Each structure stands twice: as C-alpha cells, then as structure tokens.
C-alpha cells in the first residue's frame, strides 16, 4: 500500500462483480487488453492440447501466467504493492475483454469458456485457508455438519470420500449441501447422500463455485451487449474492441 492503494483487492480470485472506476491511460488500456487476450488464447490452446487435470496443463499454464504477470499464486505475506498492481491488472483487463467479447453469441461463449477454465485452475491452486477466505469474502457461506452427526455417520463418511484415512478423517469437517449443487460429484457416486443432502469435504466444491461464476458472467455479458452503443462512439477503443478476437499476439 504505497501511494494510492486500498482494500479494493482482498483476494487473488474474484468473481469480477464490481466494474472498475479508475481513470487509466490509453497505453495501459491496450497493454492490459492484449495481455489478457494472450492469457486466454494460451488457456484455450492448452485445453485443446492437454487434459485440464494433467500436470503438463498446470505447468504450462503457470509458465504463461508468470510470463504475462497475472495473479496465480497466493502470498501469505500481505498486500504488497506489486501484488496489488497485478490484481488491478487482472480486474481491469477482464472487463476490457468483456467489452471486446459481448457483441456476438459465439464470442460470448468463447469468452465464458476461457474464463471458467482460468478460474478453475486458480481455484485448484488455493490452499484450504485461502479457499475459505475466498468463500467468505463473496458471501458464499460454505462451512457445516456437527461433530456428533459426523460420529453418527462416521462409517458412511469414511466409505464416501475416496482415500480418506480414519484419523485423517477425524481431523476433517464436512459440509451439507443440497444435491442439486453437487451434480458433478453425485453423478459418479463420490459423495454420500443422506436425506437430500450431500456431505462434501473441505474436489466437487469448485464445481458449485464455477456454476455460480458462470451464471453471473453470462448475465454480465448480456448487460454489456446491452450497453454497446455507448462505446462504439469512442473511436480510440473501436479498432481494438471490434477486432480483438482477430488480433495477432
């Protein structure tokens, strides 16, 4: 927090809910737009080439994020100025690309897909503590079963979660979710269902988070497409936004 910083960027991951309000330069605008376009194209290429759970995918995506200087890893130090800068980048670039990727349904779908992929990766890199922090800052309020109920269903929980040891299981706390949100977990039978609720440990959760994210993002893109006439009049940003999808990187 050097000169003009604040608590505007608490966590690395964000749902991109609040538009930026700053006054940036045209050079900064262009640099951020192109950089995030490179990041999203890299995400798409790696998704096509590799399996998203593969270690090659993770290594290459980390390399790209480091090369373009985007937030991808947490830091249990504090909000360092450099970190703040990176987060600001991410936040502005995203919305710029929204302006670029809301004109046509095709484009919209593409954008959504890439964004979801990136978000998933970043979630996959979050430590449990950080994960909870995130789940709190956005009022997702995911916790929580009692200890007594846990002992009540101890054996069921043990046989539900893959690769969970007795003592290690005793060291873990689950959450109760309606089964309509754990579709991806229930469908392959990797989480216990009791009386319409799934008991999810502290792998499937990302799915629910992503669902929420996707909903929000789709809505946002619709609104952006509804607010397009105000931007077309700005010649400075027309060559970029109207043709970003066809920009050599």
């Amino acid at each position: 927090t050097g000169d003009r910083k604040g608590d505007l960027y608490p966590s690395s991951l964000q749902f991109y809910q609040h538009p930026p309000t700053e006054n940036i330069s045209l050079i900064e605008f262009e640099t951020f737009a192109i950089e995030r376009l490179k990041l999203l194209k890299a995400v798409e290429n790696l998704g096509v080439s590799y399996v998203k759970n593969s270690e090659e995918y993770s290594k290459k995506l980390e390399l790209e994020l480091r090369k373009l200087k985007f937030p991808y890893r947490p830091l249990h130090e504090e909000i360092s100025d450099d970190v703040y800068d990176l987060r600001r980048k991410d936040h502005i670039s995203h919305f710029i690309l929204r302006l670029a990727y809301c004109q046509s349904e095709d484009l919209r779908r593409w954008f959504i897909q890439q964004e979801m992929d990136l978000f998933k990766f970043r979630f996959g890199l979050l430590t449990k503590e950080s994960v909870q922090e995130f789940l709190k800052l956005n009022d997702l309020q995911y916790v929580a079963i009692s200890e007594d109920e846990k002992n009540m269903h101890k054996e069921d929980l043990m046989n539900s979660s893959f690769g969970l040891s007795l003592t290690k299981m005793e060291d873990t706390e689950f959450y109760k979710v309606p089964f309509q949100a754990a579709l991806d977990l229930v469908r392959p039978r990797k989480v216990f269902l009791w009386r319409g609720f799934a008991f999810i440990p502290h792998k499937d959760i990302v799915s629910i988070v992503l669902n929420d994210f996707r909903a929000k993002l789709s809505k946002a893109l619709a609104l952006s497409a509804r607010s397009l006439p105000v931007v077309q009049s700005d010649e400075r940003l027309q060559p970029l936004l109207n043709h970003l999808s066809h920009s050599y990187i």
Binding site: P19, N23, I24, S25, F95, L99, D234
Partner: protein, 182 residues
Amino acid sequence: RDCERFKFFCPKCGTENIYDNVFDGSGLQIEPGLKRCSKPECDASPLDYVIQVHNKLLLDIRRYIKKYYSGWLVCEEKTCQNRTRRLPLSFSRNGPICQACSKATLRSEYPEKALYTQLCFYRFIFDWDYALEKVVSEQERGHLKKKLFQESENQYKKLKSTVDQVLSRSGYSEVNLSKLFQ
C-alpha cells in the same frame, strides 16, 4: 502510411534528416536514428542538439493541431469538390450538407483520426522499448540492448515524453472507465 515523417535539418550541414523509425540500419550496423547525420561527410550527431529536436517536435505538433482545428471541409462529390471552412447547420443523416450542390456530404479534410495517428506515429518514431520488442530482430536486439546506447535511450525516452504529454491531453491519453462500465 499516410503520416508525415519527422524532418529535422542538421544544424551543422543543413541537410534534411527524415526519421520514420527509432533505429536505422541492419545487423550490428544498426544504431538509433538520431546518432549520426544522414550526410556521410557530416560528423554532427543530432543527439547533440536534442534541445533543437525538442523544439522542432513541439513546433510540428503545433502545426498539426492547427491543421486539425482549421476545420476544412471538402464535398465528397467528385463533380463538386467544394472546399469550405464554414460548417453549415443543415445536416443530412450522413453529416453536413454541401451548400454548393445541396446533394452531397462535407467531409473533414483533416479528421480527428488523422491527427491522432500523426501523434501516435511521432510517439512510435521515439518508442525505444516497442522498437526493441517488435521492429528489431534478435541479433540487432542483442546489439542494441547493451551499454554505449544508454544515453541515446534516455534522450529518446525524454523525446517520447513530449508526445506522450500531448496525447494525454487528447480526447480521441485518458480513458474514463466509469463512462465505459456503468
């Protein structure tokens, strides 16, 4: 491609130097344009007279701004080509209606995009970092990314600061994100 290039007359020999890129030459013979005069017999380095280069840059920027604000309009009809400074209040859906023929639109002789591109070009011909990344090759980049050019780099940064300052005051160097995202 339609922008005027930077013309600077050497104080010593008086020969015109046309600048259209940060760097001139190929391979290890590549050096910043303002390092040596275009006349082989002339040993004067324009980088020595950087105050004069700054003054000429400001004068050129003033010239282009004056050209833009002159507000010259030409009829788009080939058979009319009426040239006027006066903008009439009578407009069609496409713009001002030419008062000579009453059937064609008046177009700006020097539109805002022209001035913006001219200022961007003047920034381009002084963008050391951009030239190194995009324009310059690999071996040339290596030869230019050493010492013996740091002073030239600093002077080029100072000269680019002028065009950046001018562009910051153009509505066609600041983007108000509040107006975009609401």
